[PDB]
Design an enzyme around this catalytic site. Structure first.
Site, PDB file in Angstrom:
ATOM      1  CD  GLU A 242       0.755  13.751  22.794  1.00 53.85           C
ATOM      2  OE1 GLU A 242       0.990  12.751  22.132  1.00 53.85           O
ATOM      3  OE2 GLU A 242       1.194  13.894  23.942  1.00 53.85           O
TER       4      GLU A 242
ATOM      5  CG  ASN B 129       2.881  12.140  18.671  1.00 56.31           C
ATOM      6  OD1 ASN B 129       2.436  12.918  19.916  1.00 56.31           O
ATOM      7  ND2 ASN B 129       2.130  11.318  18.386  1.00 56.31           N
TER       8      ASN B 129
ATOM      9  CB  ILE C 125      -1.877   7.372  13.764  1.00 56.67           C
ATOM     10  CG1 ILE C 125      -1.448   6.106  13.714  1.00 56.67           C
ATOM     11  CG2 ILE C 125      -1.582   8.306  14.596  1.00 56.67           C
ATOM     12  CD1 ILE C 125      -1.218   5.306  14.926  1.00 56.67           C
TER      13      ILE C 125
ATOM     14  CB  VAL D 286      -8.015   4.944  16.444  1.00 63.13           C
ATOM     15  CG1 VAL D 286      -8.196   3.835  17.616  1.00 63.13           C
ATOM     16  CG2 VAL D 286      -8.930   4.467  15.516  1.00 63.13           C
TER      17      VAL D 286
ATOM     18  CB  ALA E 176      -4.488   4.206  17.287  1.00 60.15           C
TER      19      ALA E 176
ATOM     20  N   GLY F 284       1.657  11.386  27.743  1.00 60.22           N
ATOM     21  CA  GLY F 284       1.280  11.431  26.043  1.00 60.22           C
ATOM     22  C   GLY F 284      -0.202  11.107  25.661  1.00 60.22           C
ATOM     23  CB  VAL F 285      -3.483  12.597  25.581  1.00 61.07           C
ATOM     24  CG1 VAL F 285      -3.465  13.923  24.656  1.00 61.07           C
ATOM     25  CG2 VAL F 285      -4.672  11.916  25.700  1.00 61.07           C
ATOM     26  N   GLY F 286      -1.502  11.556  22.543  1.00 58.74           N
ATOM     27  CA  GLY F 286      -1.600  11.582  21.242  1.00 58.74           C
ATOM     28  C   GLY F 286      -2.207  12.445  20.393  1.00 58.74           C
ATOM     29  CB  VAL F 287      -1.612  13.530  16.758  1.00 55.38           C
ATOM     30  CG1 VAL F 287      -2.219  14.385  15.774  1.00 55.38           C
ATOM     31  CG2 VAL F 287      -0.202  13.843  17.106  1.00 55.38           C
TER      32      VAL F 287
END
Ligand SMILES: CO[C@@H]1[C@@H](OC(=O)c2ccc(C)[nH]2)[C@@H](O)[C@H](Oc2ccc3c(O)c(NC(=O)c4ccc(O)c(CC=C(C)C)c4)c(=O)oc3c2Cl)OC1(C)C
Length: 186
Positions: free
Chosen positions: A28, A32, A76, A79, A82, A84-87
């Site tokens: 992940e 990014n 970022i 949240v 805010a 791919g589930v994000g950092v």
């Protein structure tokens, strides 16, 4: 967000016992980084497996927007939204995460614990380079059985990502035994 991902980690990151989720924490973060290269700002990404069972990912992109309340980077990192589930999810599932950004002539640093920042994004120096660096220690209260990063799994995906992003340089380093690879396929 935060609390909810912590309560049902599997639904967001995958199997928390067979190593699938463990390694996808790394993927992940790399994805990014890949975006900054697809945007035309990043040229090389470096992935490192440290001997204390942590992984770091650094690139030379623009660096996550800083400055404000909270900085855009903290939003970022904490949240939800805010594959791919994000950092933000990676951060909430890490007993410790270190964030370093080089942007607009300054070096910014911040430490997180289970997703909670010990303090606000602070400036600690000057620099004439740009880029982002995230290093995380997986929460052993979430991840079981397979708790140590396997180099081959990382090498396998990093190669496929290299072929799908001709132009971007990707390096893999294992500090536990000196292994190292450089993917830059055609
Ligand atoms: C986890 O972070 C990821 C990045 O991950 C990373 O780069 C990353 C993570 C781990 C590693 C090693 N690299 C990367 O995916 C991607 O990067 C972007 C995506 C879009 C922009 C952008 O539109 C810019 N234009 C601006 O003028 C600007 C200036 C001030 C400002 O408040 C905002 C809004 C704020 C945000 C956060 C978009 C925009 C700009 O300047 O920068 C950007 C960056 Cl660095 O998206 C994030 C959400 C920021």
């Amino acid at each position: 967000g935060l609390d909810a991902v912590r309560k049902r980690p599997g639904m967001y990151i995958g199997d928390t016992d067979d190593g699938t989720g463990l390694h996808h924490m790394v993927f992940e973060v790399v994805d990014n980084a890949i975006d900054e290269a697809l945007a035309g700002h990043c040229k090389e990404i470096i992935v490192t497996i440290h001997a204390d069972n942590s992984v770091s990912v650094q690139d030379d992109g623009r660096g996550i927007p800083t400055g404000i309340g909270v900085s855009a980077a903290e939003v970022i990192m904490t949240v939800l939204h805010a594959h791919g589930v994000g950092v933000s999810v990676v951060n909430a599932l890490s007993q410790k995460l270190e964030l370093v950004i080089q942007r607009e002539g300054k070096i910014h640093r911040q430490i997180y614990e289970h997703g909670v920042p010990q303090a606000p994004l602070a400036v600690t120096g000057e620099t004439e380079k740009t880029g982002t660096m995230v290093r995380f220690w997986p929460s052993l209260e979430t991840f079981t059985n397979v708790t140590e990063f396997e180099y081959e799994i990382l090498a396998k995906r990093l190669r496929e990502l290299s072929f799908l992003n001709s132009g971007v340089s990707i390096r893999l380093r294992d500090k536990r035994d000196g292994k190292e690879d450089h993917f830059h396929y055609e």
